Amino acid sequence: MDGVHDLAGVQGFGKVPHTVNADIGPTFHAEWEHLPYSLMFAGVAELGAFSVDEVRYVVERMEPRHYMMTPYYERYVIGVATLMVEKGILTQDELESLAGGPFPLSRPSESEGRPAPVETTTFEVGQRVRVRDEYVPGHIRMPAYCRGRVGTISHRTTEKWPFPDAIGHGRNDAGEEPTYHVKFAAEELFGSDTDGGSVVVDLFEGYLEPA
Amino acid sequence: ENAAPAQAPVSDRAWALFRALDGKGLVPDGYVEGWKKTFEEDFSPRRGAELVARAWTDPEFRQLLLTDGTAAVAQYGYLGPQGEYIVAVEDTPTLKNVIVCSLCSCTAWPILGLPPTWYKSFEYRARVVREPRKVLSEMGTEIASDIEIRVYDTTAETRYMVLPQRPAGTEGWSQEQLQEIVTKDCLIGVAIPQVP
Ligand SMILES: [Fe+3]
Ligand SMILES: [Mg+2]
Ligand SMILES: [Mg+2]
Ligand SMILES: [Mg+2]
Ligand SMILES: [Mg+2]
């Protein structure tokens, strides 16, 4: 999904709000901040109502201006609440009644997702690959800066996981794929407009093709 | 035009979500409290520091950590949520590694601790992939001209830690002494361990 959450390479932001080793304070800066992660785990591990991938996608589905003005932990409160409503576990009415006011949610999905690709290749360390020049309106774990770009395999995972584009929509056809650490030269991604060396992206097999 | 939607206070919304689920019997007794304790007390960059100090003083462990990070971390019992498949990345005299999740906040929670606000910031997520030298410089870390910066974007299930270079002036230090100078920021890759 080409949403505003795909931030890598966006220009115009100011300084990172940190100096190295500065005191970052407590883990949680408010008494509710542990709730989104804890209730995500309730949903995933206890209820089996959704996957972690579905949580990523529902946050991506926040209305774009809403996403941009909402602090991190609050996005996950909104995302988990949205999933609970979409899965028929909770109603928006009861959330707003208990909250004592408006509780706007993420927008409905505009894609049913897609299955794990049928045709993929097992790649080896050192092989050159290109990121498939594909556009996916639903969940995908490929940041746009690498779409269509060429890099070299530095690692093939020894484990396999469900394809995000499927499990992020709760589909039954996510299968399993390993992922690959693909190293791109900075200039491959941003031309002359970068001060870096290389960027390594961890890409599902189904996002790749021989170069 | 472009205005924020009307919203109840965030605390009221977060606790409403808890109460709605809890009132339906869907949240076990002490569940969120248990997670809070895990997040605050167990998931910690002190664990990553321990791993680094061990690698620095034990060549055999160093090689295990760099070839099978998951197995190395398992020896200490530090695998966990958002830290089940671990890859450690080695800094060298010509290479500085830095970790980000440009798409959200993906972090090796059990060994680095939950990500800090700055790491989840739009500023870090947008900029470090494209201009890591300037970002690190602004944050207080000067990377020498003869050092390649490599940014790992945490886009799938691999969870990363940086193994920084061991600084001069620490020769013969105990593991406890070495652990002390390996900070959260060193494990993320934005800082270099400092010797007083
Ligand atoms: Fe993330
Ligand atoms: Mg985009
Ligand atoms: Mg606000
Ligand atoms: Mg030495
Ligand atoms: Mg001594």
Side-chain angles (χ1 to χ4, degrees), chain B residues 76-90:
Chain B
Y76 280 80
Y78 299 158
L79 297 177
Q82 295 302 300
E84 295 182 63
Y85 190 91
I86 303 297
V87 169
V89 296
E90 180 194 12

Side-chain angles (χ1 to χ4, degrees), chain B residues 131-185:
Chain B
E131 55 180 2
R133 199 174 295 267
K134 181 174 186 183
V135 169
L136 265 62
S137 176
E138 290 172 356
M139 296 179 69
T141 301
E142 289 303 308
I143 301 300
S145 177
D146 67 299
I147 297 166
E148 178 190 346
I149 298 169
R150 176 168 300 152
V151 176
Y152 284 81
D153 198 349
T154 307
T155 46
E157 293 280 43
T158 307
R159 294 286 176 276
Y160 295 105
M161 56 168 282
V162 176
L163 180 63
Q165 292 191 281
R166 182 173 176 177
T170 64
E171 292 85 358
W173 281 23
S174 70
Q175 285 183 50
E176 183 173 325
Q177 286 166 335
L178 292 165
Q179 282 161 20
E180 195 178 14
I181 68 162
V182 185
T183 65
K184 189 181 182 79
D185 287 353

Side-chain angles (χ1 to χ4, degrees), chain A residues 65-77:
Chain A
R65 299 177 191 81
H66 196 195
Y67 183 101
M68 293 306 286
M69 54 71 71
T70 299
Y72 179 87
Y73 277 124
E74 178 179 341
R75 297 199 295 272
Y76 295 81
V77 171

Side-chain angles (χ1 to χ4, degrees), chain A residues 56 72 76 141, chain B residues 82 100-107 115 119-120 125 154-155 159:
Chain A
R56 295 195 178 88
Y72 179 87
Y76 295 81
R141 292 307 287 184
Chain B
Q82 295 302 300
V100 63
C101 178
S102 70
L103 295 166
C104 47
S105 65
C106 314
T107 292
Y119 175 97
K120 300 173 283 191
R125 290 176 46 202
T154 307
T155 46
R159 294 286 176 276

Side-chain angles (χ1 to χ4, degrees), chain A residues 2 11 13 21 33 43 61 64-65 68 72-73 95 119 124 126-127 158-159 173 177 209:
Chain A
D2 278 345
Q11 292 176 307
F13 286 103
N21 301 144
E33 288 184 344
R61 289 191 279 122
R65 299 177 191 81
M68 293 306 286
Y72 179 87
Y73 277 124
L95 287 167
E119 297 270 325
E124 306 295 333
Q127 296 190 323
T158 59
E159 297 294 322
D173 52 15
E177 294 187 348
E209 67 193 19

